[PDB]
C-alpha cells in the first residue's frame, strides 16, 4: 500500500525502495543499505520516495555533521524522541536527556525507556532512522557498523514503535566487509553521460531562466 514515485534513471532503485519500505513492521527489514558513489542520486531518490508516502515516519540524520560515534548516539536519542513528540502530541512522556547516552547500551536503555510510553497506540508502527552517509564519519572503525546491525535485537519485540535503520554508503569495500550479514542492499551505479546531460538540463535550465 505504498506509492512509487517516478525518478528519471532510478526506476529499479525506486521499485526496490517500494519493495522494502512500508508502514507494516512485519514485512520491513530491520536494516537496509543504499550503496553508491557521490552524485548517484541516493539522497534524491530516498527523498522522493518519502515525499510520495507522507504516512511513513522518517527521521533524517547526517553522520558527517556528527564526526564521532558518541554524538551519533546522542543525535539518535534526541531526534527519535523529538519526532515521537511531534507525531503523537497527546501522549504524555518523560523528556530523557540525550546527553545521558554515552555508550551503546545506554542508547538501548534510553530507546527502551522512550518506547515503553507509546504502548497505548493501536497499530504497530515503523520509525525509519535514516543514516545518510554512515561511512562518512571522520572517526570510523570496522566495529561500529556491527553495533547498528545488532541494535534491533536488544529492543523489545512486541513494542508499538519498531525502529528501522536505512543506511547510505559510499564505498564498495566498506560494504563488502559486512557481506555475511545478508542485509538487503540497493546499488546506485554511476550515471551515463546521456543521463548526466538529461539531469543537468532538467535541474539547471530553470535556474538559468531567472539569472539576472
Amino acid at each position: 500500500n505504498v506509492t512509487t514515485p517516478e525518478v528519471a534513471f532510478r526506476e529499479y532503485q525506486t521499485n526496490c525502495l517500494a519493495s522494502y519500505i512500508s508502514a507494516d513492521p512485519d514485512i520491513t527489514p530491520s536494516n537496509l543499505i543504499l550503496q553508491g558513489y557521490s552524485g548517484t542520486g541516493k539522497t534524491y531518490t530516498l527523498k522522493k520516495y518519502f515525499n510520495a508516502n507522507p504516512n511513513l515516519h522518517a527521521v533524517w540524520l547526517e553522520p558527517v555533521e556528527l564526526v564521532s560515534w558518541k554524538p551519533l548516539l546522542q543525535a539518535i536519542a534526541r531526534t527519535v524522541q523529538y519526532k515521537l513528540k511531534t507525531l503523537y502530541p497527546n501522549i504524555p512522556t518523560t523528556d530523557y536527556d540525550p546527553l545521558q547516552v554515552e555508550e551503546p547500551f545506554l542508547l538501548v536503555k534510553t530507546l527502551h525507556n522512550i518506547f515503553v510510553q507509546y504502548e497505548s497506540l493501536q497499530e504497530k508502527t515503523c520509525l525509519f532512522l535514516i543514516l545518510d552517509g554512515f561511512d562518512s564519519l571522520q572517526d570510523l572503525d570496522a566495529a561500529l557498523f556491527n553495533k547498528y546491525i545488532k541494535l534491533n535485537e536488544l529492543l523489545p519485540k512486541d513494542s508499538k514503535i519498531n525502529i528501522k535503520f536505512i543506511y547510505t554508503m559510499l564505498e564498495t569495500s566498506f560494504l563488502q566487509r559486512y557481506s555475511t550479514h545478508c542485509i538487503p542492499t540497493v546499488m546506485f551505479p554511476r550515471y551515463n553521460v546521456d543521463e548526466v546531460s538529461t539531469i543537468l538540463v532538467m535541474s539547471r535550465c530553470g535556474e538559468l531562466m531567472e539569472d539576472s
Binding site: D97, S173, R177, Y178, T180
Partner: protein
C-alpha cells in the same frame, strides 16, 4: 557555566575517606575491638526469584543421577592435614603466617580450604582455639583489584571506606594495634594471579602484613601455578610468600572413581517406583526398576580424565553427560515429557567422551560451497608452489582464474564457469572476482579458518591459514571435483 564535556552517569558510593589511625586520639585509647558491635561481623535478595509452579514436573530415573553429579573428601587428606596444622598452630599461638597452595583447575583446592576453615570454626566453637574471623577474597570477583582493600576492611571493622583509606586502615590495624585488643583473621586469597597488578602493591601489602608481629593474620593464597611468584612477582614478595608451598596434584583414576561413587552411593544399584504412565520416578502402572551405572564405565571415564587432566569437574560432567544421553534415549522410546533395569553403560560414556574430542573443522569445510572450497584449494596450491605460509589475495584471484581456465575440459567446470563469472545471465559482464568472492572470504574469516591483514589494497593484502594444512587437505580430498584436478 558552559562545560567542555559532561559526565551525566556518575554513580558514586557512600564511602568515607578518613582512615582508622585517626579514629581515636592515641594508641592507648583504642578499645577492645572484639567487644565492639560492628567489628568482626557482629542475603536481602533471596526472595526475588520465587514463583508458584502451577505444575507437577516429571523427574525420571536419571534426574536424581544428574543432580547427584553436580559440582554444587576421600582423596585430599594429606593436604587437608598440612593446611589444618599450619592454620591451627597460627591461630592458637597468635601468629601471623602465609600458606601457599597451587594447582590446576578442579583438583579440590577451594573445597579443601573451605573444609579446613569449617573444621577450624568447629574447633573454635568448642574453645579448643581462640575465635577468629574468616574472610574470602576472590580476585576474579572484584571489579577493581583494589576493591579487596575495601572488602577485607569492611569485613573487619564494618566501615565502608575508599580503597586507599581502607588500605591505610588495614596497615594501621595490623601493625600498630596490640594483640590483646584484637582477633585472629584468616583470609583466603582465591585466584591470586588476578590480584597481580603492574606495581605489585596489593601482593606486597597482603604478604607483608603477615610479617608484622602484631597482625594476627593468616593468608591462605590459592594460585594456578607453583612458580607464579618466581614468574610474576618481585624477590621481596617471593621471600615473604615463602619456600614451603603446597601442590594440589591432579587426581588419579582411583580417586576420580572414589569421588564419582561417593556421588552415587544412595542411588546406584537401587530400586525405583517408576510410574510408566508419566515416567516420574520415586525412590524407595508402576514398576520396580533397578538403576545402575557400570563400574567399567566409571573406570574408562576416570582413566581418560585422569590421564588428560585429573579434573574432578571434568569427570563429573562426563558422567552427567552420559546420564543425559541415556535419559534422552529413554524418553525418546516412551514419550515421557517434562510437564526393568536402566543402565548408564560403557557406550554412553564413550559417546560423551568422544563428543568433546571429534573436530567439526573438517566437517565444516566439507559442507562449504564450491567457491569457498575453490578458495581453499587455490590457497593450498599457492602455499605449496612458492612455499610461503602467507599468500597475497591477488595471487589467490589469479590462481582461481588459472584453475578455472586450465581445467576447461572438466564437465563441472564447463557447467559452472558461466555461473562463477557471470551468474548465468548473459546480461552481466564478465567479472574480475568470482560470484560470492567477498562472501566466502568473510565467511572463512568469521569461522576462524583464515587470518587476514589490515591493509586497504585488496590485491597485496595477505591471507594465512589459521587451521592445520593437513586438515585443509583432508577436507579438500573429500570433494569429488577438487580431488580430480
Amino acid at each position: 557555566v558552559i562545560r567542555k564535556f559532561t559526565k551525566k552517569n556518575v554513580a558514586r558510593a557512600k564511602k568515607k575517606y578518613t582512615p582508622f589511625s585517626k579514629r581515636f586520639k592515641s594508641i592507648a585509647a583504642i578499645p577492645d575491638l572484639t567487644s565492639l558491635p560492628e567489628f568482626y561481623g557482629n542475603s536481602r535478595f533471596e526472595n526475588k526469584l520465587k514463583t508458584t509452579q502451577k505444575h507437577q514436573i516429571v523427574e525420571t530415573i536419571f534426574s536424581k543421577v544428574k543432580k547427584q553429579l553436580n559440582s554444587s573428601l576421600p582423596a585430599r587428606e594429606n593436604e587437608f592435614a598440612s593446611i589444618y596444622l599450619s592454620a591451627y598452630s597460627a591461630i592458637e599461638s597468635d601468629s601471623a603466617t602465609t600458606i601457599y597452595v597451587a594447582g590446576t583447575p578442579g583438583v579440590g583446592k577451594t573445597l579443601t580450604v573451605r573444609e579446613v576453615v569449617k573444621e577450624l570454626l568447629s574447633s573454635s566453637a568448642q574453645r579448643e582455639i581462640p575465635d577468629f574471623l574468616y574472610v574470602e577474597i576472590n580476585g576474579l570477583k572484584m571489579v577493581k583489584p583494589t576493591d579487596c582493600y575495601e572488602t577485607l576492611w569492611n569485613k573487619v571493622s564494618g566501615e565502608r571506606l575508599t580503597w586507599a583509606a581502607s588500605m591505610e586502615s588495614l596497615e594501621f590495624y595490623f601493625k600498630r594495634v596490640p594483640k590483646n585488643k584484637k582477633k585472629t583473621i584468616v583470609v583466603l586469597l582465591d585466584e591470586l594471579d588476578a590480584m597481580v597488578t603492574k606495581s605489585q602493591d596489593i601482593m606486597y601489602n597482603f604478604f607483608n602484613w603477615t610479617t608484622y608481629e602484631n597482625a594476627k593474620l593468616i593468608v591462605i593464597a590459592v594460585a594456578n601455578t607453583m612458580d607464579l611468584p618466581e614468574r610474576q612477582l618481585g624477590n621481596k614478595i617471593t621471600s615473604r610468600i615463602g619456600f614451603t608451598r603446597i601442590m594440589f596434584t591432579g587426581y588419579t583414576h582411583e580417586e576420580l572413581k572414589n569421588i564419582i561413587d561417593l556421588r552415587l552411593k544412595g542411588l546406584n544399584d537401587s530400586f525405583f517406583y517408576v510410574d510408566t504412565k508419566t515416567g516420574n520416578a520415586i525412590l524407595i502402572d508402576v514398576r520396580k526398576v533397578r538403576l545402575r551405572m557400570s563400574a567399567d564405565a566409571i573406570e574408562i571415564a576416570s582413566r581418560k580424565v585422569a590421564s588428560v587432566s585429573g579434573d574432578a569437574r571434568r569427570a563429573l560432567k562426563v558422567c552427567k553427560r552420559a546420564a543425559e544421553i541415556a535419559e534422552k534415549h529413554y524418553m525418546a522410546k516412551h514419550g515421557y515429557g517434562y510437564d526393568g533395569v536402566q543402565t548408564v553403560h560403557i557406550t554412553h560414556v564413550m559417546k560423551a567422551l568422544n563428543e568433546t574430542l571429534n573436530s567439526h573443522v573438517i566437517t565444516f569445510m566439507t559442507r562449504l560451497s564450491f567457491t569457498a572450497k575453490l578458495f581453499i584449494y587455490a590457497l593450498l596450491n599457492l602455499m605449496k608452489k612458492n612455499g610461503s605460509q602467507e599468500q597475497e589475495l591477488g595471487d589467490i584471484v589469479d590462481e582461481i582464474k588459472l584453475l578455472i581456465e586450465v581445467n576447461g575440459s572438466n564437465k563441472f567446470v564447463m557447467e559452472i564457469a558461466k555461473t562463477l563469472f557471470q551468474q548465468g545471465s548473459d546480461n552481466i559482464s564478465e567479472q574480475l572476482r568470482i560470484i560470492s568472492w567477498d562472501f566466502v572470504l568473510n565467511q572463512l574469516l568469521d569461522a576462524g579458518i583464515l587470518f587476514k591483514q589490515t591493509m586497504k589494497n585488496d590485491r597485496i593484502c595477505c591471507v594465512k591459514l589459521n587451521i592445520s594444512v593437513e586438515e585443509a587437505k583432508r577436507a579438500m580430498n573429500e570433494d569429488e571435483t577438487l580431488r580430480n584436478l
